Every structure is written in structure tokens, then in C-alpha cells.
Design a protein around this ligand. Structure first.
Ligand SMILES: NC(=O)c1ccc[n+]([C@@H]2O[C@H](COP(=O)([O-])OP(=O)(O)OC[C@H]3O[C@@H](n4cnc5c(N)ncnc54)[C@H](O)[C@@H]3O)[C@@H](O)[C@H]2O)c1
Ligand SMILES: NC(=O)c1ccc[n+]([C@@H]2O[C@H](COP(=O)([O-])OP(=O)(O)OC[C@H]3O[C@@H](n4cnc5c(N)ncnc54)[C@H](O)[C@@H]3O)[C@@H](O)[C@H]2O)c1
Ligand SMILES: NC(=O)c1ccc[n+]([C@@H]2O[C@H](COP(=O)([O-])OP(=O)(O)OC[C@H]3O[C@@H](n4cnc5c(N)ncnc54)[C@H](O)[C@@H]3O)[C@@H](O)[C@H]2O)c1
Ligand SMILES: NC(=O)c1ccc[n+]([C@@H]2O[C@H](COP(=O)([O-])OP(=O)(O)OC[C@H]3O[C@@H](n4cnc5c(N)ncnc54)[C@H](O)[C@@H]3O)[C@@H](O)[C@H]2O)c1
Lengths: 289, 292, 289, 292
């Protein structure tokens, strides 16, 4: 099991640390524009493997990602349109190299805006869409389930609620079909306040410590684990749906997206989702050139 | 964390081995009418802890179950069903009177068959609160149904939300009308009836081939115990009090035992079958009432 | 990772259960003379996998052990010479089938007397000795370390003491070179009583519950884990030493016995070890024919 | 199980993440002079617990470390060594006075550099028993040496019994004369000196390349904490009191902290080097005595 990580900054290094702690890969290759920083991270992370699984951890060039089972893209530049433009250029260059050196790999994109950049990866690489996913709303869906579980006295495993759409303050909860232990959620255990807290927490973290990285590192490691272990767990990654990438329920196994799950939405949820899609489609048009 | 096991036969010793392998308890006390067998099992199981967790494993008398956090009842023999119900109810009555005396604050998990009827006997004889007395019910069969459905439909069993309920055994039923996969009705996601029949009948096949069954229930019991010890609030289908009988039914399990039941909707067919199960159990209870 | 188990009695089924609980193999094939009993065990054990790792668990014929990475021999008949004669016939037949259907596998023998039967396996299969081991004194060495650790207030990981020789009441502790955290054991923390208790405990278990199986199942699973994970852990299996199989320190990795460790013994330990060897060599002469 | 972390910088937050991933604590309290940064780290780390263990993670003031089972000190800046010793001793004195006041019964693990000197300052200022104050010493370097030796000689690191001791850094030494593999002197089992030099110098290389080091010490600290929480009695080389200085040295670690040291024999060369290390530490202590 070989995993390469493109962009060894705060998110890339934290995710490598979590993958080491999960003991699921044999080799991690770290790539960065800053060659010294990647070499320093690789050596520090190698030291951490001492307490877990024997692994190869090394900095490399793009040729060193050849044969990777999975490639994580965690690169990014130091207005929202300004960020999308800057990162689209970065992701295009990364994607041309993955296509060249790892034509058969599976790509998970984290770079923001995650849904837009995931589509860029898919288009530039030419891969099948099932082999290109973004982390979408995976973290927020998991957090919403944990908080509902806590508030209603039940394991999050029994809380079946999805957050879908464009990752960020315009994502939406699919309340109408949410359930706990197979009964409607409203008839089991206000819930809107919890979703609001989840949706906005990322802005608060960035506001206070400058960036966010431990949450996404853990969500990404969970997703990677279901690929490596061929679990078929249902996530809400960024996935191809109707000519855009958007957060949406999907079964993930060793081949990537096995299928999407077409959940039912009421009128208001349908409207928010189509509005989420429209916003994504316009950012894509902007970076078309 | 102290667990006592009453009846150190095939199931009792297999469950002790699984709990050791799970590394969730500090002390296991083993009880049996056959004193030397319990001592031999305890020594052998102590050897196994070498590779897992430092623990106390010992055979003991009822005074040694004092202060147990959990007591498992795996006693009795595995003949008509009424004859078995009568014989095991007498065994379970005596065990229950001793747990009442020596571990009045504990939580009891009953495995002895027929598991729903015997769980009710435990509850009545100990005088415990019903949340502190449960049987293993349909937990194994529900878990197997979700695994097989997930295999057949290409999804994790964590995403298959289907329950087997009712009287453990040939009378149990799958709550198909409310089953779902990933928050979509099961029909529209993916044959189900054949998978259920395979699950429901497998215990008979195992028993006919190797004489008894023990590894499946040992693993299911260990999972239930982990949810109590870890205060997880996971949903199981144990034997739980539902109005005026113990029966397999969805329930939230945490450190205090049964937190609540989950009232699922059943269609007309399923309601008829569940009521048939409840009737069978209640008539067994009425038949052994004079023994309680 | 495919493991086959020959003899699905108390030890065979307990070991399969422990291997399932350890989640290290993808497939276990169970063989027994009693075909119904093997099928019943396989189905019960399959049910246990539900709570652990997805696995194939099945009863099979000898052709079904083809391709096994590891084969465990846990078969045996229902005086000591009488048992050795009875089990030697059993092990010869099993070994001829392993040679035929799994020529490239690694064999771990548990059938008693474990040191004698391990040699029979080696000779009949024609395998390289590094690919044939018995469980030797692994359990008793582990127990001695746990009890010393408990009595002296230290982790068993830091207790370096070996039990060697013929498994049973004539095995011996290599006290003169034992140590705790790299100082002589006598100068760290009577120890003879602990060893005596360890050596004799198996007779007591058999005496009280008719047989023993959970201890050896756990020791065998530990040994299998160091092979599968290529750990290079030091055990005291039955290994080829000077034209006999005998319990002795050895490094175990994915290829089996990587090497033995030639520890130093004082005069009395040397005498006991050579006496242990002589006893084994005479049982081998007896079943030569 | 409650752990407080004083100094939520690169090392403090990385160690919190590793402790979360290890699932050994129920509550982590994070303290920092930079209040908003600590709050942001706590929120981000709370998100990570979603995938591991239900926990409380929160930023707090010193009153919030009351009742902590363990307090980790990861504060200070990473200039001469004497200037750093002076500046960090003042930081550590203030932290130690606050832990003394709000968590007088706790166990302290110091990471702040220079780790041996600072650990002694913690011990002196808190007035704690020495078994309850330890530094991370040479724990990481010892673990790395055993891993690399095992790789080179084809054996598990569990079978390599070698210690790095002395002052953490360029002054530390390997106790080669008593090192062993599988109960045989290391020379006769399997170049060692080059492996040690690689270990001893790697921190400098990491720091020059990525500016700081944090993942290795976070993992080593988490292993040490697990041995305390699990009452394991594993042997480490933390910074521990050895007569009248704190220095890296073999020690048995259990739920009470340092159970005992292990007096290994050193040859003449190693004794000279260890005495040189002790001298360096003691003269730093004498130099900052007026600050204590
Ligand atoms: N939910 C999410 O999807 C999520 C969460 C958090 C962060 N992010 C995003 O992840 C990305 C990284 O965040 P971070 O905190 O680690 O930033 P960072 O600045 O710490 O690290 C970014 C790394 O990318 C490197 N890099 C820049 N251009 C590159 C290029 N062409 N090729 C290769 N490497 C390049 C940089 O040298 C740097 O090391 C950002 O886009 C961030 O918005 C996404
Ligand atoms: N799904 C389930 O609930 C399930 C599954 C498997 C087995 N079982 C049942 O578990 C029970 C035990 O099965 P087993 O295979 O281990 O049988 P077993 O005969 O191997 O062991 C039963 C033990 O109970 C002991 N015992 C008998 N009377 C006792 C008494 N008054 N007090 C204390 N101990 C007593 C016996 O000495 C014996 O050791 C049976 O009733 C079996 O039907 C239930
Ligand atoms: N430390 C050790 O090495 C250790 C420990 C415990 C037991 N043992 C030994 O393990 C062996 C099994 O012990 P057990 O308690 O499981 O006995 P058991 O009677 O419960 O099981 C033995 C199995 O072997 C089967 N069998 C018999 N002949 C066979 C043949 N030619 N081919 C295939 N299968 C055959 C039998 O049908 C039976 O199922 C015994 O020899 C025992 O002495 C060794
Ligand atoms: N092997 C080791 O022992 C080892 C390894 C690595 C780092 N370190 C040392 O750990 C310490 C922290 O390293 P870092 O990379 O995390 O530095 P950092 O600058 O990233 O974080 C240090 C934190 O300490 C805070 N702080 C400063 N003064 C404080 C005070 N009086 N009270 C409370 N908090 C205070 C700061 O606000 C900052 O957040 C350094 O001394 C470093 O040398 C030791």
C-alpha cells in the first residue's frame, strides 16, 4: 500500500501523521514545492513510525509517486474568486503530473474550494470519475451525527443524517429523510442550531488559529481506510453528479466511488441543493479558460 | 471492571475467551456446579491473558461474584421445548436468587435458552429493574442479516438498517417494511427472503453438525458487553422488556443497560407475526408461573 | 493471507477463533477426519467473523489447503510411548498431504509430543527446516515472563528469560543468562518456584477440565502474527538444532526461522539440555520405522 | 482520565492530536498565553475526536487544570544555549508555580528544552515528589536506535536491549558495553557507531529543514503517557532524578510515575562520558539557581 501526498503543509503533514497512527500503508511519499520542508517533514514523520508500524516515509519528486495506490492533494496558495483562480492553476499542474506518473491511481482532493478543485482534477487527469473524489462534506456530516447522538443519547452509528451540497456555509442538511435507528429523527429525540454550529465552525477555527487541519486529516484518514479495507462505507465526498462535483452520498470501496445513493429531498432541500450546484457551476465556468 | 460468568460450559468458556481477547475487563470470576472444571477453565483462560491484558481469572463461589459490574448466565442444558423450558426455568430461578443475594446492584445478561422466556424469569426472580436485565435475543441473527445483505448489495453492514425481532428461533421475523440502506428503503437500493431464511435456520444446522453452537453467541455477547462497558448507546435487538414480556426488539444499550426501546413501525403482515411471537412467549410464561 | 488448520478439535477450533479475533488472515480452511464436525465448526466460526474482519471460513478437503501461506497441525488421537506411536502415524499422513498440496507453505505443528512430531513433519514433508516449526515452549516462556514481571513490578517486555528443551516437565529455564532491563535478574528483584508452577500447570489443567486449548491457541496466534507481520520476534519454538527438533530461541519472520540465537548455559543447564535432547532422540528412534 | 497541556504550540497541539488518536483520555484541557490560538486548536482537535473516542477538548485557564491526572509542559521557545536555558527557566518557574497551586496531586511530564535542566526546575519549583516529575529525556532516540539496530540485524526492536543515556542532545551516549539482542551481547549477534551518530544528529537536521521538530516527540510522549495510564511498568530513558540531577537514564514507569531507576553497568569510556554529561547539566543548574 503506497500513498503519495502532494503538498506537505499543515494539512498534508497532519494527514500523514494520522495515516501513520492508523497503520494502514506501507509507504508514504511526500511532495512539495519547498523541497527542504518536505524532507524535514518526512524525517520527523519517519521518527513517529517508530511507535506504530514499520513504514517507508520519504520526500520525493513526481516520479516517486509512480505506482501509488492513492494520491492525496493537499497543496494550496498562501477574495474567494482569487483563491479559486490561484488554486486552479496549482491543481492543473499537479493533475498533469499525476496523469503522467500515476495513471492508474485513485485521487482524493482536499485543496479548496474542494468541490470545484475536484472537478478540475477529474477533467485535467482524464480519469474515470469513480477514481477522483474530494473530501466534500465528510467532516461536517460526521460531526453532525456525533452531536445529534450526544444530544439524543444514542451512538452516532445509529444517526443517519447527511450534509450535502457545496462544502461551506451553503451546504445543507437533508433533514426530511434523516433518521435514528430507522425511525424519523423528529420522532426519536433545535436540530437547526446544531447544523448551524457545524457549518460555521470551520470559519471560527481559521479565525482563531489561522487555519484548520486536524479535523480534515482525521476525516481523510477515515475515507482512505474504507478504500484500503474495501469497506463500502457510505460517505458524502465530492463526487461527480450531473456534470459537477458536489458533496453527495456515495458508497466508497477499493475502486473508489462504487455508486451514489439517490436520496429524496423535499421542495426546500431540492431548491438549496440546486442553488448549491449553480454556485459551483459558475466557478467552473470562471476557470474554464 | 469485574465480570462473573455462571455456567462455565462451552458457551461460558468461549465467551470468557472472547472477553479476554477483547481486553475490556480487569477480573473474570467463573462459577459452575462442576467445581474442578471451572478451576481448569480458569487456569487455561488465565494462560491466554498473557497475550492480551493483565487480568484476574479465577473460579469462585457465589460470594466471589460480589461487586460484579456484569453477570453473564450461560448455564443449563441445550426433548420437547416445554420440557426444556421447565428444566431451565428451575436452574435459572436458583441462579437468580443467588445473584439477587450476592450482587444486587449488578447488570445481568442471560444466554440460557429459551432466551426470551429465561430473561423474563431472571427479571422476575431477582427483582431487578428491567433495564438491568437483558438477554441476547436476536443480536447475532440481526448482525448476520446485515452482513449478508451488505455482501449481496455491495455496501458496508454499517449502512444496512434492518432488524430481526420476536422470539429467538424459528418464530423470529425480519422487519422488512422499514429496512433501509443508507437512508433509502431497502427495496430501491439493491433475494432478501432467502437471506433471512438462511440466517434463521443456521443455528439448527450448526447444532446438527457439531452438536452445539458457541462461537457466534460468544462474539455477539462480547459486542453487547463492550457497548455497556464503553457506554456507547449502540442499538441492538436483545431480549428486552416490551410491556409485559421479554422479547427480541430494538433497544439502545449504554453503561446503565437498556436506555430505551425504539418503536419501529410494522406492516400488517409483520404485526401479525410479531403478535404470534409474543403469544408463544406469554403462554410459556403462564405455564411456568407456578415455578417463579 | 490463507491459513489452513488440520484437525478441528478443541485446539484447532479455539485457534481459529483467536485468529478471527486477531483479524490477520483473509481465509481459514478447516480440515478434519470428522467431516460434519469441521463443517459445523466452520459455520459457527464464520458467524463470529461478523464482529471482526470479513473472512472466508470453510471446511475443506486436502486440495482446499493449496496455496496456504501457513498450515497449522492440531490433530491428534483421542502411556507416553502409546501416544507418540499413535500420533506419529497421524502426522505422517498429514505431512504427505501437505507436501503434495502445499509444497511451498510454512507449517506450525502443535500435535504432541510437539518436539518429536515437528521432526516427523520436517522429515516426511522434505521441507527446509526453516519452514517447519513447532510451538515448543512458547507458552511457558511467555507465562514465566509475565509472572516474573508481576513479582518484580516490571513489564514482561523487559524480562528476558528463556525456557528451552523438551516441552513438558523436563524443560528448563536458562536462569544463568536471564535478565531484567539489561541487568542480571538476580540483581534486579524463589524464582524456581515460579518456573515449577509454570512447568506443571498444563498437567493440572488437563487434570481438571480434561484438556488444554486456550493457552496454546493464544500462543499460536502470537507466533502466526510475527510471521504474517514479518516482525522478527524472538520465540522458543520447536526448531531444528543438532539433528533434533527442540525448544530453543529463534528469530521468526515471514520466512519462518530466520536464525537461532546461541545462548550460553552454565554446566547444570547444559547437562539438562543435553538430557532433554537425548530423550527426544530416543522417541525419534522408536518411530523411525 | 484528564490531561492538561501547557503550551499549545506545534508540539503541544501535535501531542494532543496523538493522544486523541490513541484514545486513552476522557478530557484534554489546553492552556496558552495566546488565548484565541488555544481555543482554535481545541475546536479543531475536538473535530478530530469524531473518528476516535468521545472526549472533552477545551481551552482553559489554570483553574481548569484542577484534578488533572497528568500535566504536559510543552511551552517556551525552541541564540546561545545559556540564553535559552535562562529564558525557559523563567517560563518554567511560572508554569510550575501555577501547577503547584491548581493541581498539586498531578504527575508532570516536561518537554520544554533543555529538557533535563527544565525537568529539574519543575521538580524544585513545584515541590513535588521526584517520582511525579519526569522529562522526555532520550526516549525518542533510544527507540530509534533499537529500531535501526533491529532493521540492520534482522530482528524485532523488542529484542534489542540498548539504552541512550545522559544529557539529551549532542552529549548523550549509547551504553554499548551492556547492550544485548535476545539475551546475547550485541557484538556477537550482528556498524553500530554510525547508527548512533545518525540518531543523535537527526534532530538538528529536521530543525534546519522544516524549522522545528514535533511529530517524533509527540509520539514518544504519547507512548510514555500510555505506560502511565495503563500501569505497564515499561522501561524508558526519561529525564529522571539520578541522585542530584535530572538526566536521561533507564527507569520503570507505571501509574505512579517513576517506580525505580535501573542501575546499568558502564565501562570506563562510557562512565567518563556520562560524568561529562552530568557535569554539563549540573553547571547549568548552578547557573540558574538564583532564579529558582
Ligand atoms: N475541508 C477541506 O477540504 C479543507 C480543509 C482544510 C484545508 N483545506 C485546504 O487544503 C489546502 C492546504 O491547506 P494547508 O493549511 O495545509 O496550507 P499550507 O500553506 O500549510 O500548505 C500548502 C502546501 O502546498 C505547497 N504548494 C504550493 N503550491 C504547490 C504546488 N504547485 N505544487 C505542490 N505543492 C505546492 C506549499 O509549498 C505548502 O507546503 C488549502 O487549499 C486549504 O484551503 C481544505
Ligand atoms: N442464542 C442463545 O441464546 C444461545 C446460543 C447458544 C447456546 N445457548 C444456550 O446456553 C446454555 C449453555 O449452553 P452450553 O453449550 O455452554 O451447555 P454446556 O452443557 O456445555 O454448559 C452448561 C454449564 O452450565 C452448568 N450448570 C448446569 N446447571 C447449573 C446450575 N444450577 N448452576 C450453575 N451452573 C450450572 C453446567 O455444569 C455446565 O457447565 C444452553 O441453554 C444453550 O441452549 C443459547
Ligand atoms: N503445547 C502443545 O503443543 C499442545 C497443547 C495442547 C494440546 N496439544 C495437542 O494438540 C492436539 C489436539 O488436541 P485437542 O484437545 O484439540 O484434541 P481433540 O480430540 O479435541 O481434536 C483432535 C482432532 O484431530 C482429528 N483427527 C484425528 N486424526 C486425524 C487425522 N489423521 N487427520 C486429520 N484429523 C484428525 C480428530 O477428528 C479431532 O477433531 C493433541 O495432540 C494435544 O496433545 C498440544
Ligand atoms: N525532545 C524534546 O524534549 C523536545 C522536542 C521538540 C521540542 N521541544 C521543545 O518544546 C518546546 C515547545 O516547542 P514548540 O515547537 O511547540 O514551540 P512553539 O513556539 O510552537 O509553542 C510554544 C508555546 O508555548 C506558549 N508559551 C510561551 N510562554 C508561555 C508561558 N509562560 N506559559 C504558557 N505558555 C507559554 C507559547 O504561546 C506557544 O504557543 C520548546 O522548548 C522545544 O525546544 C523539546
Amino acid at each position: 500500500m503506497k500513498i503519495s501526498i502532494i503538498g506537505t503543509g499543515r494539512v498534508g503533514s497532519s494527514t500523514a501523521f494520522a495515516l501513520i497512527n492508523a497503520a494502514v500503508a506501507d509507504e508514504i511519499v511526500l511532495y512539495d514545492l519547498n523541497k527542504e520542508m518536505a524532507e524535514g517533514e518526512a524525517l520527523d514523520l519517519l521518527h513517529a513510525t517508530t511507535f506504530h508500524k514499520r513504514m517507508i516515509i520519504r520526500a520525493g519528486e513526481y516520479s516517486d509517486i509512480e505506482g501509488s495506490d492513492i494520491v492525496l492533494i493537499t497543496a494550496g496558495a498562501a477574495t474567494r474568486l482569487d483563491l479559486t483562480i490561484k488554486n486552479a492553476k496549482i491543481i492543473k499542474g499537479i493533475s498533469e503530473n499525476i496523469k503522467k506518473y500515476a495513471p492508474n491511481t485513485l485521487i482524493i482532493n482536499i485543496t479548496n474550494p474542494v468541490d470545484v478543485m475536484s472537478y478540475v482534477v477529474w477533467k485535467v487527469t482524464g480519469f474515470e470519475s469513480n477514481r477522483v473524489i474530494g473530501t466534500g462534506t465528510i467532516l461536517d456530516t460526521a460531526r453532525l451525527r456525533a452531536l445529534i447522538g450526544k444530544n439524543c443519547g444514542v451512538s452516532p452509528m445509529s444517526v443517519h443524517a447527511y450534509i450535502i451540497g457545496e462544502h461551506g456555509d451553503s451546504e445543507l442538511a437533508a433533514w426530511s429523510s434523516a433518521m435514528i435507528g430507522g425511525v424519523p429523527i423528529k420522532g426519536f429525540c433545535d436540530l437547526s442550531k446544531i447544523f448551524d454550529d457545524v457549518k460555521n465552525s470551520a470559519y471560527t477555527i481559521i479565525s482563531k488559529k489561522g487555519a484548520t487541519n486536524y479535523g480534515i486529516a482525521s476525516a481523510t484518514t477515515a475515507l482512505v481506510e474504507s478504500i484500503i479495507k474495501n469497506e463500502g462505507r457510505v460517505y458524502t465526498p465530492s463526487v461527480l453528479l450531473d456534470d459537477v462535483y458536489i458533496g453527495y452520498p456515495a458508497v466508497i470501496n477499493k475502486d473508489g466511488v462504487e455508486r451514489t445513493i439517490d436520496i429524496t429531498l423535499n421542495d426546500e432541500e431540492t431548491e438549496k441543493f440546486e442553488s448549491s450546484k449553480s454556485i459551483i457551476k459558475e466557478y467552473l465556468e470562471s476557470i474554464k479558460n
